[PDB]
Curated annotation (Swiss-Prot):
Glycated in diabetic patients. The modification N6-methyllysine is found at residue 532. Zn(2+) binds at residues 65, 245, 247. Ca(2+) 2 binds at residues 11, 253, 257. The gene is ALB. This is Albumin. Plasma. Ca(2+) 1 binds at residues 4, 242, 247, 250. Changing residue 61 to N: In Malmo-95/Dalakarlia. Belongs to the ALB/AFP/VDB family.
Length: 582
């Protein structure tokens, strides 16, 4: 069209426009104050209005990159505040924009955002919704310069829904606090998944990305043909590459194009895309990526037909190795919405290794004849781990289950930091209380989903300050081997126990006035420390100490005088427990 700004303004709407422009500026000029971004937003919005009125008004023909760059180069203290970035303003638009991307600090040194008391949030909310949401939208955006803006907007709307509902509530905190804690964690998940995807595309490359996509796309769109899924995997690959590079505009347009493409060829891809395809521009793709699996054909052939029995397997394979393997994947994925994607990759790899070391053999059909039999153990491993861990989780509750994982992992990698073990073990616990609620056929995909950010999360920390070759081994392993690798870790028999420390096991009355979350973390921390001191303790011996301690808390909190009780019964516990654990 003649004017990009006019166009984007028209189909986005003034409200969404103003919010996205704010997010975009905050992601670049991460250091400028809120008031300064607001002024820029107004100016751009006002400019946009001009172009809507007259497609030919001055500058309305300029591209969004150019306009955006010029306005960015308007900041007077660009050099005094951002220094080197100001030099970007000396380049021509193609490089100017590229120059701006390179200086986008992925993790600046801003103070952590503190959550104020519910009454002050609700009052600030009621007294001025706009500036209240925009300011925090600003705070989140500057800290997460790579968070896809439209999605960051999608979150804002959920935050607003939570205040609207909760601030008019009888018990505001009882309504708000849990909603904010859920929004936060979810916000974290989305952010980490985005970073992980881009990171993985760099290490492993396009082939791995494509395989993962064929598997995922065909599980969701089991009725589409392999050529449609291939088409989609290709476009999808261009979109992620672009979006990872960090250019919002290119990214947003690539996502829009793909979304309309899918919606137009709707009936040819999935029947569950109707809802999503009605929604407005800003939401289409977000919706589609989240869409539920379509129902499969039911009248579907046996894989062993074309991939085992049939002659020409090797002829079809040598003619185009990746396409044939992709075909396998497509065929195997759309018949298994219940398998995790990485499990579908393990099978595809196994199949590949087999065809390679078989198609170069006397009688092919016989060399690879029993390949589907190798799959069995690959499939069962993840299944058995799930049932097993969900069972245990049903018995104990979330908390006691978290404590079990705490003992398990501490004995495996005692070298790891206690606060790290505590955190990882807790999140792992939450993955259990979130996936085990699901019926079997959906558990594995669930776990994979959550378990992957947790494992990467833990791998990054270890990256910083490495403490074990084994963790490093699993962390640098292949995407397909990461989780099985951690699963294979055995008790660390080498580990030399920490010297006892009286302090570490001294508890005061403050443990009675602390919040549930706080109390638990103190107990759990003492637990990791317990195991690090007596790594040979039994589940029996251990459970006995945890039982004494259990009461010890109550017998001292619900006691006439604390302090003393904890120092009196406290001396006892430690002396006794030390003896039981020899
Ligand atoms: C102290 O524990 C946390 C945990 C997660 C946090 C933050 C602080 C902060 C604040 C800070 O950076 O200090 C942000 C921004 N977190 C997110 O990951 C996030 C991302 C997107 C949304 Cl929509 C919501 C939350
Ligand atoms: C629809 O296309 C994809 C492609 C890759 C994906 C995902 C989705 C999802 C999300 C989903 O499972 O739907 C995750 C988590 N991916 C990765 O971890 C990943 C794996 C390998 C590489 Cl090389 C790069 C990224
Ligand atoms: C997502 C952008 C909209 C901003 C609204 C967020 C309001 C809640 C402020 C609290 C943020 C601190 C993060 C947290 O710990 O919950
Ligand atoms: C000045 C540059 C900022 C202009 C705002 C960028 C336009 C955002 C369009 C988002 C389209 C939704 C695409 C999607 O489905 O993800
Ligand atoms: C999962 C289905 C992908 C739909 C396309 C939306 C782009 C997401 C990036
Ligand atoms: C057009 C379809 C292309 C998909 C290619 C299929 C390749 C499957 C190989 C199994 C995945 C192993 C991943 C890896 O180790 O890099
Ligand atoms: C079920 C969540 C509780 C935590 C225990 C982890 C069990 C899930 C392990 C299965 C991993 C699925 C991904 C994969 O196949 O590698
Ligand atoms: C940094 C110390 C924590 C490391 C603990 C490893 C956690 C691995 C998670 C794998 C979950 C699958 C269940 C399992 O096989 O143990
Ligand atoms: C050397 C032995 C010192 C004894 C220290 C005992 C502390 C163990 C913490 C037990 C926490 C279990 C959690 C719970 O009961 O809910």
């Amino acid at each position: 069209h003649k004017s990009e700004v006019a166009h984007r303004f028209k189909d986005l709407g003034e409200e969404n426009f103003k919010a996205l422009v704010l997010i975009a500026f905050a992601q670049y000029l991460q250091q400028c104050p809120f008031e300064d971004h607001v002024k820029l937003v107004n100016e751009v919005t006002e400019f946009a209005k001009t172009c809507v009125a007259d497609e030919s008004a001055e500058n309305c023909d300029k591209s969004l990159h150019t306009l955006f760059g010029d306005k960015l180069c308007t900041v007077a203290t660009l050099r005094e505040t951002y220094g080197e970035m100001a030099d970007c303003c000396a380049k021509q638009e193609p490089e100017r924009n590229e120059c701006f991307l390179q200086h986008k600090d992925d993790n600046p040194n801003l103070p952590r955002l503190v959550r104020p008391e519910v009454d002050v949030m609700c009052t600030a909310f009621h007294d001025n919704e706009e500036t209240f949401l925009k300011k925090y939208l600003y705070e989140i955006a500057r800290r997460h310069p790579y968070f896809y803006a439209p999605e960051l907007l999608f979150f804002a709307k959920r935050y607003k829904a939570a205040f609207t509902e909760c601030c008019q509530a009888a018990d505001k905190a009882a309504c708000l606090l849990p909603k904010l804690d859920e929004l936060r964690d979810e916000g974290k998940a989305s952010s980490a998944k985005q970073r992980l995807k881009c990171a993985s595309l760099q290490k492993f490359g396009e082939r791995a990305f494509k395989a993962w996509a064929v598997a995922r796309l065909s599980q969701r769109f089991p009725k589409a043909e392999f050529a449609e899924v291939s088409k989609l995997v290709t476009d999808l690959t261009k979109v992620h590459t672009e979006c990872c590079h960090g250019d919002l505009l290119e990214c947003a347009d690539d996502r829009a194009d793909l979304a309309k493409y899918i919606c137009e060829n709707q009936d040819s891809i999935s029947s569950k895309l109707k809802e999503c395809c009605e929604k407005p521009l800003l939401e289409k793709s977000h919706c589609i990526a989240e869409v539920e699996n379509d129902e499969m054909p039911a009248d579907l052939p046996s894989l062993a037909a074309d991939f085992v029995e049939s002659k020409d397997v090797c002829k079809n394979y040598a003619e185009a190795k990746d396409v044939f393997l992709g075909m396998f994947l497509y065929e195997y994925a759309r018949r298994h919405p219940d398998y995790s994607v990485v499990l579908l990759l393990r099978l595809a790899k196994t199949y590949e290794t087999t065809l390679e070391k078989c198609c170069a053999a006397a009688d092919p059909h016989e060399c690879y004849a029993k390949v589907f039999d190798e799959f069995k153990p690959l499939v069962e491993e993840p299944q058995n781990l799930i049932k097993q861990n969900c069972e245990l989780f049903e018995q104990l509750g979330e908390y006691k289950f978290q404590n079990a994982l705490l003992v398990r992992y501490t004995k495996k990698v005692p070298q790891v930091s206690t606060p790290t073990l505590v955190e990882v073990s807790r999140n792992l616990g939450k993955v259990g209380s979130k996936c085990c609620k699901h019926p079997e056929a959906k558990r594995m995909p669930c776990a994979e989903d959550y378990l992957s950010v947790v494992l990467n999360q833990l791998c990054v920390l270890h990256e910083k300050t490495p403490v074990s070759d084994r963790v490093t081994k699993c962390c640098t392993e292949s995407l397909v081997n990461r989780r099985p690798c951690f699963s294979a870790l055995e008790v660390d028999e080498t580990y030399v126990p920490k010297e006892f420390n009286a302090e570490t096991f001294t508890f005061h009355a403050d443990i009675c006035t602390l919040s549930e979350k706080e109390r638990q973390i103190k107990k759990q921390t003492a637990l990791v420390e317990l195991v690090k001191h007596k790594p040979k303790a039994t589940k029996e011996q251990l459970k006995a100490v945890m039982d004494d301690f259990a009461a010890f808390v109550e017998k001292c909190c619900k006691a006439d005088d604390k302090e003393t009780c904890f120092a009196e019964e406290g001396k006892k516990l430690v002396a006794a427990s030390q003896a039981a654990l020899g």
